[PDB]
Amino acid sequence: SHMWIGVISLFPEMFKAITEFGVTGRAVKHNLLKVECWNPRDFTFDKHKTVDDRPYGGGPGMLMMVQPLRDAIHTAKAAAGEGAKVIYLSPQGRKLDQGGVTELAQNQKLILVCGRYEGIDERLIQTEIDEEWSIGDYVLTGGELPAMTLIDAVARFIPGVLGDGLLDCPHYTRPEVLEGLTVPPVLMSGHHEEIRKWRLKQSLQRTWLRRPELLEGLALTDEQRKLLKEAQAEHNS
Amino acid sequence: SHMWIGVISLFPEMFKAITEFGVTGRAVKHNLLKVECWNPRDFTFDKHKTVDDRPYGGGPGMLMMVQPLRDAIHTAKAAAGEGAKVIYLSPQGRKLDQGGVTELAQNQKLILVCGRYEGIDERLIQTEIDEEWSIGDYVLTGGELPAMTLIDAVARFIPGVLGDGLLDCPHYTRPEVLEGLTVPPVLMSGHHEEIRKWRLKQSLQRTWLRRPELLEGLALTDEQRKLLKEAQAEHNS
Numbered sequence: 001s002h003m004w005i006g007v008i009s010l011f012p013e014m015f016k017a018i019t020e021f022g023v024t025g026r027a028v029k030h031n032l033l034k035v036e037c038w039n040p041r042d043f044t045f046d047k048h049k050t051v052d053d054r055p056y057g058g059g060p061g062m063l064m065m066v067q068p069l070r071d072a073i074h075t076a077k078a079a080a081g082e083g084a085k086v087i088y089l090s091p092q093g094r095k096l097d098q099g100g101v102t103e104l105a106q107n108q109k110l111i112l113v114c115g116r117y118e119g120i121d122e123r124l125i126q127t128e129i130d131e132e133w134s135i136g137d138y139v140l141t142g143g144e145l146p147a148m149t150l151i152d153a154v155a156r157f158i159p160g161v162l163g164d165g166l167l168d169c170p171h172y173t174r175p176e177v178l179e180g181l182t183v184p185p186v187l188m189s190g191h192h193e194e195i196r197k198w199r200l201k202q203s204l205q206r207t208w209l210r211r212p213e214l215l216e217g218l219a220l221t222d223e224q225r226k227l228l229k230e231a232q233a234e235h236n237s
Numbered sequence: 238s239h240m241w242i243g244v245i246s247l248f249p250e251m252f253k254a255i256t257e258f259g260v261t262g263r264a265v266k267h268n269l270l271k272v273e274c275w276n277p278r279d280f281t282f283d284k285h286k287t288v289d290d291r292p293y294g295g296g297p298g299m300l301m302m303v304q305p306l307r308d309a310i311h312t313a314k315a316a317a318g319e320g321a322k323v324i325y326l327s328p329q330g331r332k333l334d335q336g337g338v339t340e341l342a343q344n345q346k347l348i349l350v351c352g353r354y355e356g357i358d359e360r361l362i363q364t365e366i367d368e369e370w371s372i373g374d375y376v377l378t379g380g381e382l383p384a385m386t387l388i389d390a391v392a393r394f395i396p397g398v399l400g401d402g403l404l405d406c407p408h409y410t411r412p413e414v415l416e417g418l419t420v421p422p423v424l425m426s427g428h429h430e431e432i433r434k435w436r437l438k439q440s441l442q443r444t445w446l447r448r449p450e451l452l453e454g455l456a457l458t459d460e461q462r463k464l465l466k467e468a469q470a471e472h473n474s
């Protein structure tokens with residue numbers, strides 16, 4: 001079950017960063033993920049291929065020009081056929097987290113609209129956009145990095161692309177001693193069950209110390225409650 | 238006051254997405270922003286230029302190999318000279334928001350370490366990394382998009398690169414009527430003070446409706462309290 005993602009962007013070449021490299025580049029080459037871009041600049045008709053326009057009411061910056069952007073979106077929708085969810089990325093959208101990613105990854109087709117300048121006309125959001133998503137509470141120069149971020153996150157859910165609420169456990173590889181710091185002996189033990197439990201305990205400890213609010217949203221298993229209690233007692237010596 | 242950002246990455250060509258395009262591409266061309274990449278692959282010595290390694294304790298995936306990555310980091314640090322803050326990007330880090338961006342943007346030099354595979358050896362975090370940052374609570378195939386995201390966000394603070402706690406107001410441009418939806422008349426009025434207040438009221442309304450938790454962190458001005466009260470009364474008819 002592959003995924004098709006239409007992208008509307010003034011800078012489609014930025015998307016080479018995900019389509020030509022690494023796990024996502026492989027997903028594209030192997031036709032697990034298809035990324036197709038439309039550039040509003042190609043839908044302009046004036047001699048200087050104008051893609052921005054002045055905001056009503058005045059203001060510092062420009063907005064994306066409506067007609068080229070609208071026509072690009074319509075073209076992507078026509079290419080997508082039925083059932084594509086159209087998403088605009090901005091700080092005003094639903095904040096993305098891994099539950100949100102798993103929801104988005106249920107769609108076979110997405111169209112991602114990337115804002116530039118100061119953004120896009122509100123009526124295009126009303127008339128063309130199904131959902132608005134943010135990758136986090138910060139401001140960027142464009143929606144392309146947010147679109148790529150979203151693409152990379154959902155691509156991990158496509159079968160073939162790759163080989164629980166808590167932060168990751170610490171990881172160790174060679175050498176056994178690095179600037180005087182040794183690998184925890186349990187990881188050398190070959191005791192699979194002890195190693196599982198140690199990793200889970202470490203994730204519980206690190207989530208508690210760094211992101212305690214994330215624990216509040218979980219229904220811990222008996223085992224997790226036990227390991228967390230242990231980590232907390234060790235922390236309190 | 239420009240910014241230098243060292244990047245450690247197995248896929249330095251991904252960074253063309255920010256160094257060759259748009260506002261950030263211009264910042265680079267004009268020497269406001271300098272982005273310099275070191276690839277651990279160039280610091281390998283074996284015939285197959287191996288950059289991953291098996292985790293102690295077992296597990297599904299691989300980690301980044303310590304020696305090539307450590308040597309790349311040391312080389313970037315030597316290039317940076319004194320006062321560079323070294324950052325590793327991962328979901329285990331401090332979650333980035335715009336206050337975090339403004340803090341990071343105070344550094345003249347940053348080195349950004351991009352994780353691949355299942356991550357990096359914990360002792361490298363202990364010995365080489367000053368700070369750990371996340372761009373949000375979701376999992377990606379690599380730290381490069383997070384590094385670019387961070388770079389784009391802080392670049393906005395560099396003088397020359399560009400031309401308050403609340404979500405943005407709606408924006409409008411031509412045409413005056415779009416699929417039957419008209420521009421709010423206040424924006425056509427030319428009344429600058431009325432336009433300012435309308436925009437601020439809209440931001441307060443949209444923050445309240447979509448992200449009410451963001452309001453809790455603000456000390457609203459008398460004017461903002463008034464406009465928010467108005468928006469809330471209109472909402473309740």
Ligand SMILES: NC(=O)c1cnc(NC2CCCC2)nc1N
Pocket residue numbers: 089090091115116117118119120133134135136137138139140141142143146
């Ligand atoms: N946190 C985010 O998701 C995000 C941040 N900044 C922007 N900037 C664009 C949108 C308007 C003009 C440029 N887009 C995003 N999707």
Ligand SMILES: NC(=O)c1cnc(NC2CCCC2)nc1N
Pocket residue numbers: 326327328352353354355356357370371372373374375376377378379380383
């Ligand atoms: N939310 C984030 O910031 C983020 C997410 N995923 C990753 N994946 C890398 C890190 C370990 C191997 C791949 N890095 C990040 N910085």
